[PDB]
Design a binder for this molecule. Structure first.
Ligand code: ZN
Ligand code: ZN
Ligand code: ZN
Ligand code: ZN
Ligand code: ZN
Ligand code: ZN
Ligand code: ZN
Ligand code: ZN
Ligand code: ZN
Ligand code: ZN
Lengths: 321, 322
């Protein structure tokens, strides 16, 4: 195991108020389909009614796929030295925070870690793609488990870690294709018609867009209920929520669909991602400016600052806060 | 002791093949949004507009907002996110690499100093051009300020002295340095008037300050063009290319902010949005990146290496200008 932060120190310890953070790892969401970034439809109407939400209009993802971007999102090495083949053997930020006492839990309704959780106890990773753990899989014809199912019973995690610092990753299914029409329950079918087939190139363009934007409305609801769930502990915990998407998505420009293109050739749409940060006013955390130029490189500094941790390798590195 | 980052660096072909001669103009205080090619409403680069083969890069971000921070970073191997200005002078930089692989390195400075970038090479490869001892062009203006075009005089003696070798020539411009923009150019570029002729810029009328700044750009446009014109006189025997990047931008009164030097955490967009131009001769086989490519000062080191067919297993995937 190769270290990058054994100098890491937690300045104050939970004493002081414990801190509770949800990190929503998003999936396949494009920045230019976010209402706040100038999009022509209102894809985030619930987040708009929550005070304290910062939308970041200029964030660029590490890469264009889940396997590539996710480990880089928790890396110390930054996009320009990230190497997907050796990422799993590096100390990542969750290894650091777990070593300083923060309780880490990772619930996944997408796929896996991807390696990011592999040095921590297996009990701290939970698969939520199956109805064995996810209580919300019967809400749609496809028996697809839903991201909001990752919220059920999180109060049992808090009680089991009463008074400790806590960081909760919720890894979204989000907007992953090609079958966007299956990513959301029927209550979010606001834009119609939608394309209902797995060959995007036969979709009519607007039907494809409509399905994709309905999926964002489902993600907007999931994020909104994530913050509402944290508000039930604003009494005993300093609560914050952070959202960043792993990568964007192509929707037919120059004939390009889905994602996964090499960075040297990937179009703008595959790397321009939304990010949200919310925190309760009790907590004293100040978000950076909304138009700050940011990348996935800001996640690791952000996560460390959220828990008052210092490591002489990532400070002065721009964060979301 | 010097800390190395590219002792693996390898030159694929040697000068065999045609030798290569490159001028790298390190600019000063130039803003991307005052360049005509980037949509500015005045023609601040009328001579560069008449040269075939010039690529303008419309989305380049400087490492920092000052000479001390940006210049060493422009030649670093570490990238902005691991660059540490306090220790940059003990790092192998890209000029150390190219020098040990045989490329002849020259640094002429009409700005200040290196800043540390040249400190491991023989002092004969750095030349001060701020004074009339080396610069022949200083009596052209009330202030006896020596001019950037004086750095072009006698470069054929350097080429002759390194005949057939690969060569990279840094010319460190005085350029658009403030606050006295009106002093940076001779009267032949005093095209936009009235101009402000005082130090504390806030009393200036906005247009008169802008006018002095834009005349200063016309002087730079002339310096780059004649740099290209000088390289064209050796396109026969050498593959010639010119690269220009400014060290940082400049604030011109927006929200009351002038000059540069703000910490990156608070710096306005204008202090970091810089022009970059790359020119190359017909014969040379070098292809520019797309002009809207998102770039930073981190692209300079790979560019210089690729210009000399050098590969270094540390910047191998890093975006360049070419
Ligand atoms: Zn995917
Ligand atoms: Zn993904
Ligand atoms: Zn490194
Ligand atoms: Zn780096
Ligand atoms: Zn590899
Ligand atoms: Zn400067
Ligand atoms: Zn100065
Ligand atoms: Zn310092
Ligand atoms: Zn030599
Ligand atoms: Zn200066």
């Amino acid at each position: 195991t190769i270290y990058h932060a054994k100098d890491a120190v937690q300045a104050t310890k939970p004493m002081r108020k414990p801190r509770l953070v949800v990190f929503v790892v998003g999936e396949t969401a494009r920045a230019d389909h976010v209402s706040f970034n100038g999009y022509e439809r209102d894809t985030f109407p619930q987040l708009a009614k929550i005070d304290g939400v910062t939308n970041f209009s200029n964030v660029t993802s590490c890469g264009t796929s889940t396997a590539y971007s996710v480990p880089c999102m928790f890396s110390y090495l930054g996009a320009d030295e990230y190497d997907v083949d050796t990422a799993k053997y590096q100390e990542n930020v969750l290894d650091t925070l777990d070593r300083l006492g923060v309780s880490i839990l990772w619930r996944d309704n997408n796929s896996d870690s991807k390696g990011v959780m592999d040095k921590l106890p297996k009990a701290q990773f939970a698969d939520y793609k199956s109805a064995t753990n996810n209580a919300i899989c019967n809400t749609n014809p496809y028996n697809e488990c839903r991201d909001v199912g990752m919220l059920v019973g999180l109060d049992d995690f808090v009680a089991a870690n009463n008074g400790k610092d806590m960081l909760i990753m919720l890894h979204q299914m989000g907007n992953h294709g090609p079958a966007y029409f299956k990513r959301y329950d029927e209550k979010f079918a606001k834009f119609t018609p939608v394309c209902e087939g797995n060959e995007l190139a036969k979709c009519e363009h607007q039907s494809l867009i409509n399905a994709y934007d309905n999926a964002l409305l489902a993600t907007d609801d999931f994020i909104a209920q994530s913050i509402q769930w944290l508000q039930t502990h604003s009494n005993a915990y300093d609560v914050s929520m952070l959202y960043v998407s792993d990568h964007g998505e192509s929707l037919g420009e120059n004939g390009v669909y889905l994602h996964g293109m090499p960075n040297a050739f990937a179009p703008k749409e595959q790397r321009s991602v939304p990010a949200f940060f919310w925190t309760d006013k009790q907590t004293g955390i100040t978000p950076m400016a909304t138009d700050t130029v940011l990348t996935h490189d800001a996640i690791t500094p952000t996560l460390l600052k959220l828990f008052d941790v210092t490591a002489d390798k990532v400070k002065d590195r721009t964060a979301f806060i």
